């Protein structure tokens, strides 16, 4: 009689396979608002 | 080494990329052998894919879409049930929009010249020629095989005929459609094929 060759795998080795890692490269880039100039005068600087 | 190791695509990936790595090493502090992320190749060569009338199409047309091999045989009655569902599914994708969404590369397990062309007349997408050796090369890459004659390398039959597997640029499997698989959800596993993430770069 012929020998039927073996086919079969456990469920762990057919589902838990090494996987492509996620391609993550993204920081949180923030833009600083420019400070508006200090255009303020004291009263004693105005009329005196 | 994705998805498997003992594949004819795999052994030609590493051999060619270390060949260019050794040349750039002697033309120049780099690591050997190269990493799998640096593995680059062309999957389908310049004269592989062709639609009806046997006209070749370059793979620059394939980018921006979701291509998927359809490992099939015209005599297997599992497969014959899946032709009108795959024809209907592929047809509705490509009509509904400005551009074609998916694409199917037909890979055949027929017996002779007459068996290929009798199957080939019922379908409009691309194909790989049976007599071209690359048909044998992709089966032993994806472990898609009907009956055990070629020795797999400690693996098992990942799936029998038929199967639809969506592929990536470097040859990896993206998601498996479980027609006859651990899920066995035949004639409805085609609905699980998304195309936003499985885009051919």
Q: How far apart are CA B158 and CA B69, in angstroms?
A: 14
Experimental technique used to determine this entry: cryo-EM
Of B160, B123, B168, B118, nearest to B139 (Cα)?
A: B160
Interface of B with A (CB under 8 A): 1-3, 148, 151-152, 155-158, 172, 182
Q: Which residue in the set A4, A9, A15 is minimally distant from B156, CB to CB?
A: A9
Instruction: Report whether B81 contacts B189 (CB < 8 A).
Output: no
SS3 assignment, position B195: coil
> Closest residue of A to B149, CA-based?
A5
Q: How far apart are CA B105 and CA B92, in angstroms?
A: 17
Report the DSSP beta bridge partners of residue B50: B56
- Output the six-digit token pair for B86: 């795959």
Test A14 with B158 for CB contact under 8 angstroms: yes
- How many residue contacts between A and B have a Cβ separation below 8 Å? 20
Of B170, B162, B169, nearest to B189 (Cα)?
A: B162
**Of A6, A16, A19, A20, which to mutate for an interface test with B (greatest number of B Cβ within 10 Å)?**
A20
**Of A2, A6, A7, which to mutate for an interface test with B (greatest number of B Cβ within 10 Å)?**
A7
Q: Which residue in the set B2, B157, B182 is minimally distant from A7, CB to CB?
A: B157
Taking the Cβ of residue A45 and every Cβ of chain B, the question of whether any pair is shorter than 8 Å is answered with no
Chain A residues near residue B2 by CB distance under 8 angstroms: 18, 20
Residue ranges of E strands in chain B? 66-72, 102-108, 126-127, 163-167, 173-177
Q: Which resolution in angstroms does this entry have?
A: 3.5
Taking the Cβ of residue A15 and every Cβ of chain B, the question of whether any pair is shorter than 8 Å is answered with yes
Longest dimension (CA), chain B: 57
Q: Which residue in the set B2, B3, B155 is minimally distant from A9, CB to CB?
A: B155
Of B104, B24, B3, nearest to A19 (Cα)?
A: B3
- Output the six-digit token pair for B63: 């980018």
Test B182 with A17 for CB contact under 8 angstroms: no
Residues 6+ apart with CB under 8 A from B134: B44, B45, B48, B128
Chain A residues near residue B3 by CB distance under 8 angstroms: 17
Q: What b/e string do you get for B12-32 counting C-beta neighbours within 10 Å, with b at 16 or more?
A: ebbeebeeebeeeeeeeeeee
């Amino acid at each position: 009689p012929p020998t039927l060759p073996f086919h079969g795998e456990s469920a762990y080795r057919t589902d838990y396979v090494p996987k492509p890692l996620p391609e993550v490269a993204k920081p949180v880039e923030v833009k600083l608002p420019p400070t508006l100039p200090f255009n303020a005068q004291s009263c004693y600087r105005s009329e005196y | 080494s994705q998805p498997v190791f003992a594949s004819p695509l795999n052994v030609e990936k590493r051999r060619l990329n270390e060949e260019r790595a050794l040349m750039q090493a002697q033309k120049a502090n780099i690591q050997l052998p190269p990493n799998y992320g640096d593995m680059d190749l062309i999957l389908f060569p310049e004269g592989s894919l062709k639609n009806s009338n046997n006209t070749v199409i370059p793979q620059s047309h394939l980018k921006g879409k979701s291509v998927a091999l359809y490992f099939a045989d015209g005599a297997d009655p599992k497969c014959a049930s899946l032709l009108p569902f795959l024809l209907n599914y592929y047809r509705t994708m490509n009509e509904g929009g400005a551009n074609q969404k998916i694409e199917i590369i037909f890979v055949s397990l027929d017996r002779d010249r007459e068996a290929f062309e009798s199957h080939r007349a019922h379908m409009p997408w691309l194909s790989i020629d049976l007599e071209n050796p690359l048909t044998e090369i992709l089966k032993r890459h994806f472990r898609v095989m009907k009956e055990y004659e070629v020795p797999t390398y400690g693996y098992g039959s990942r799936t029998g005929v038929p199967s639809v597997i969506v592929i990536g640029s470097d040859g990896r499997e993206a998601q498996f459609l479980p027609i006859c698989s651990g899920l066995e959800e035949g004639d409805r596993a085609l609905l699980r094929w998304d195309w936003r993430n499985t885009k051919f770069a």
